[PDB]
Design an enzyme around this catalytic site. Sequence first.
Site, PDB file in Angstrom:
ATOM      1  N   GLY A  65      -4.486   7.857   2.133  1.00 12.38           N
ATOM      2  CA  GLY A  65      -4.335   6.485   2.581  1.00 12.38           C
ATOM      3  C   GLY A  65      -5.558   5.972   3.312  1.00 12.38           C
ATOM      4  O   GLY A  65      -5.920   4.804   3.194  1.00 12.38           O
ATOM      5  N   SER A  66      -6.201   6.854   4.067  1.00 15.96           N
ATOM      6  CA  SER A  66      -7.398   6.501   4.811  1.00 15.96           C
ATOM      7  C   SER A  66      -8.550   6.289   3.860  1.00 15.96           C
ATOM      8  O   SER A  66      -9.253   5.284   3.953  1.00 15.96           O
ATOM      9  CB  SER A  66      -7.748   7.606   5.794  1.00 15.96           C
ATOM     10  OG  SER A  66      -6.634   7.871   6.627  1.00 15.96           O
ATOM     11  N   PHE A 105       0.878  -1.166   0.000  1.00 12.30           N
ATOM     12  CA  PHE A 105       0.000   0.000   0.000  1.00 12.30           C
ATOM     13  C   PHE A 105       0.917   1.218   0.000  1.00 12.30           C
ATOM     14  O   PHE A 105       1.710   1.395   0.923  1.00 12.30           O
ATOM     15  CB  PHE A 105      -0.858  -0.033   1.278  1.00 12.30           C
ATOM     16  CG  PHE A 105      -2.041   0.912   1.275  1.00 12.30           C
ATOM     17  CD1 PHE A 105      -1.873   2.274   1.501  1.00 12.30           C
ATOM     18  CD2 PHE A 105      -3.329   0.420   1.109  1.00 12.30           C
ATOM     19  CE1 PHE A 105      -2.966   3.129   1.568  1.00 12.30           C
ATOM     20  CE2 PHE A 105      -4.427   1.264   1.175  1.00 12.30           C
ATOM     21  CZ  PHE A 105      -4.243   2.623   1.406  1.00 12.30           C
ATOM     22  N   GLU A 127      -1.015  -8.229   4.840  1.00 13.46           N
ATOM     23  CA  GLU A 127       0.287  -8.872   4.788  1.00 13.46           C
ATOM     24  C   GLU A 127       1.371  -7.992   5.405  1.00 13.46           C
ATOM     25  O   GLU A 127       1.602  -6.872   4.955  1.00 13.46           O
ATOM     26  CB  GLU A 127       0.639  -9.186   3.333  1.00 13.46           C
ATOM     27  CG  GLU A 127       1.887 -10.014   3.145  1.00 13.46           C
ATOM     28  CD  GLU A 127       1.663 -11.488   3.412  1.00 13.46           C
ATOM     29  OE1 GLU A 127       1.784 -11.917   4.581  1.00 13.46           O
ATOM     30  OE2 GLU A 127       1.373 -12.221   2.447  1.00 13.46           O
TER      31      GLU A 127
HETATM   32  C1  ACO Z   1       0.756  -3.763   4.116  1.00  8.83           C
HETATM   33  C2  ACO Z   1       1.169  -2.591   3.802  1.00  8.83           C
HETATM   34  O1  ACO Z   1       1.527  -2.344   2.691  1.00  8.83           O
HETATM   35  S1  ACO Z   1       2.395  -1.870   4.894  1.00  8.83           S
HETATM   36  C3  ACO Z   1       3.253  -0.559   3.920  1.00  8.83           C
HETATM   37  C4  ACO Z   1       2.709   0.828   4.198  1.00  8.83           C
HETATM   38  N1  ACO Z   1       3.352   1.753   3.185  1.00  8.83           N
HETATM   39  C5  ACO Z   1       4.350   2.563   3.436  1.00  8.83           C
HETATM   40  O2  ACO Z   1       4.912   2.668   4.592  1.00  8.83           O
HETATM   41  C6  ACO Z   1       4.776   3.372   2.234  1.00  8.83           C
HETATM   42  C7  ACO Z   1       5.220   4.758   2.647  1.00  8.83           C
HETATM   43  N2  ACO Z   1       4.076   5.474   3.199  1.00  8.83           N
HETATM   44  C8  ACO Z   1       2.918   5.643   2.599  1.00  8.83           C
HETATM   45  O3  ACO Z   1       2.611   5.138   1.377  1.00  8.83           O
HETATM   46  C9  ACO Z   1       1.878   6.448   3.393  1.00  8.83           C
HETATM   47  O4  ACO Z   1       2.559   7.347   4.316  1.00  8.83           O
HETATM   48  C10 ACO Z   1       0.892   5.494   4.171  1.00  8.83           C
HETATM   49  C11 ACO Z   1       0.166   4.506   3.253  1.00  8.83           C
HETATM   50  C12 ACO Z   1       1.704   4.762   5.281  1.00  8.83           C
HETATM   51  C13 ACO Z   1      -0.301   6.324   4.754  1.00  8.83           C
HETATM   52  O5  ACO Z   1      -0.939   7.066   3.712  1.00  8.83           O
HETATM   53  P1  ACO Z   1      -1.322   8.632   3.944  1.00  8.83           P
HETATM   54  O6  ACO Z   1      -1.957   9.169   2.681  1.00  8.83           O
HETATM   55  O7  ACO Z   1      -0.150   9.493   4.314  1.00  8.83           O
HETATM   56  O8  ACO Z   1      -2.385   8.500   5.211  1.00  8.83           O
HETATM   57  P2  ACO Z   1      -3.073   9.628   5.997  1.00  8.83           P
HETATM   58  O9  ACO Z   1      -3.350  10.766   5.073  1.00  8.83           O
HETATM   59  O10 ACO Z   1      -4.200   9.082   6.809  1.00  8.83           O
HETATM   60  O11 ACO Z   1      -1.690   9.971   6.865  1.00  8.83           O
HETATM   61  C14 ACO Z   1      -1.509  11.077   7.805  1.00  8.83           C
HETATM   62  C15 ACO Z   1      -1.860  10.805   9.219  1.00  8.83           C
HETATM   63  O12 ACO Z   1      -2.360  12.150   9.505  1.00  8.83           O
HETATM   64  C16 ACO Z   1      -3.759  12.182   9.779  1.00  8.83           C
HETATM   65  N3  ACO Z   1      -4.296  13.159   8.768  1.00  8.83           N
HETATM   66  C17 ACO Z   1      -5.405  13.011   7.938  1.00  8.83           C
HETATM   67  N4  ACO Z   1      -5.577  14.059   7.094  1.00  8.83           N
HETATM   68  C18 ACO Z   1      -4.559  14.902   7.385  1.00  8.83           C
HETATM   69  C19 ACO Z   1      -4.184  16.220   6.824  1.00  8.83           C
HETATM   70  N5  ACO Z   1      -4.856  16.793   5.883  1.00  8.83           N
HETATM   71  N6  ACO Z   1      -3.063  16.797   7.376  1.00  8.83           N
HETATM   72  C20 ACO Z   1      -2.356  16.156   8.391  1.00  8.83           C
HETATM   73  N7  ACO Z   1      -2.636  14.967   8.949  1.00  8.83           N
HETATM   74  C21 ACO Z   1      -3.722  14.398   8.422  1.00  8.83           C
HETATM   75  C22 ACO Z   1      -4.256  10.767   9.512  1.00  8.83           C
HETATM   76  O13 ACO Z   1      -5.179  10.446  10.518  1.00  8.83           O
HETATM   77  C23 ACO Z   1      -3.011   9.828   9.501  1.00  8.83           C
HETATM   78  O14 ACO Z   1      -2.872   8.981  10.648  1.00  8.83           O
HETATM   79  P3  ACO Z   1      -1.840   9.465  11.960  1.00  8.83           P
HETATM   80  O15 ACO Z   1      -2.275  10.902  12.458  1.00  8.83           O
HETATM   81  O16 ACO Z   1      -1.855   8.364  13.104  1.00  8.83           O
HETATM   82  O17 ACO Z   1      -0.342   9.472  11.440  1.00  8.83           O
HETATM   83 CA    CA Z   2       4.689 -12.880   6.306  1.00  8.05          CA
END
Ligand code: ACO
Ligand code: CA
Length: 306
Positions: free
Chosen positions: A218-219, A206, A241
């Site tokens: 992401g949410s 993801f 996973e």
């Molecule tokens: C199985 C899986 O694949 S595990 C692998 C996960 N992938 C990675 O680590 C790849 C690198 N990272 C990414 O691709 C991304 O940072 C992800 C997928 C981890 C999350 O996606 P994002 O689009 O950044 O998510 P989101 O917008 O909800 O992230 C910001 C955080 O700020 C909060 N938030 C929501 N909107 C906003 C905004 N406008 N401004 C600031 N914070 C915000 C969210 O609640 C979230 O959770 P948190 O406060 O506990 O940290």
């Molecule tokens: Ca595994």
Amino acid sequence: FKPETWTSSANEALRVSIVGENAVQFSPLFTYPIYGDSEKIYGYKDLIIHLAFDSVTFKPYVNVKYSAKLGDDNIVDVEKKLLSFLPKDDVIVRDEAKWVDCFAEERKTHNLSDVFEKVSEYSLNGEEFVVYKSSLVDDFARRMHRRVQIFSLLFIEAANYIDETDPSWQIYWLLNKKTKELIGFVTTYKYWHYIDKKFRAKISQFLIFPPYQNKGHGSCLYEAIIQSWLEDKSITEITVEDPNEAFDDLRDRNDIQRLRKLGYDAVFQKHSDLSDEFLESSRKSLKLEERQFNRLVEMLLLLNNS
Ligand SMILES: CC(=O)SCCNC(=O)CCNC(=O)[C@H](O)C(C)(C)COP(=O)(O)OP(=O)(O)OC[C@H]1O[C@@H](n2cnc3c(N)ncnc32)[C@H](O)[C@@H]1OP(=O)(O)O
Ligand SMILES: [Ca+2]
């Protein structure tokens, strides 16, 4: 002499950027899959590796620059190494003008609405966003996947390239509706063990590109996929996973909020626990994996611990 003038951190040397209205440049979180466990590059002075992608088509562009280089035999070929992880004969090297021409041209026929199935839509700050899905059998999806694929290695620890010929793979693509820029992607896997058939769906990779993170994508992307899988009667269970700290936190926040809107907040506020067959029936309703469900139950208990 001083050998530090010839040593550089691969994380600082590799500069990635997604180019649309303008190039937004950032650093990788991980480079060990490419430049070794030490994430250090030896034998180059004033090293700078540029890796750029068109914000829409993700056409790769590479450009390695250095002031000097060592003459030793086993000095790693910085450029060749990077290219080995990028799509074969799809990367424009050094010629920046050639690159721009290629993608500005490709941007013409580039349309995911003609080949991909729309899954959902949502709005964050006025702008509309679309979620599409596809397999990896057709040439278009395979081309795009091999272009964005490297992001998993650069930002997701322990990630590995998936086998594109496995039919069980299905990718979800998040893009800006009006501009068609790719915001992120998700590789999922439909598998079973034992008229129609049932499957377990799992999120393997993801990723929301760095310039678009912390904005709610992401949410929304996660909720879109889950809600989609919930509606699909052929999907038995939904699991994740090997999630990392950041994804665990996201998974939990959205899961909690979904259960609460369904009134489970009050159900886990009944001071007499609940039947096993009831916990089973509801776990199945929610399609969550047992480990995750029980974690959610735990979080919903201290939340309203009367
Ligand atoms: C199985 C899986 O694949 S595990 C692998 C996960 N992938 C990675 O680590 C790849 C690198 N990272 C990414 O691709 C991304 O940072 C992800 C997928 C981890 C999350 O996606 P994002 O689009 O950044 O998510 P989101 O917008 O909800 O992230 C910001 C955080 O700020 C909060 N938030 C929501 N909107 C906003 C905004 N406008 N401004 C600031 N914070 C915000 C969210 O609640 C979230 O959770 P948190 O406060 O506990 O940290
Ligand atoms: Ca595994």
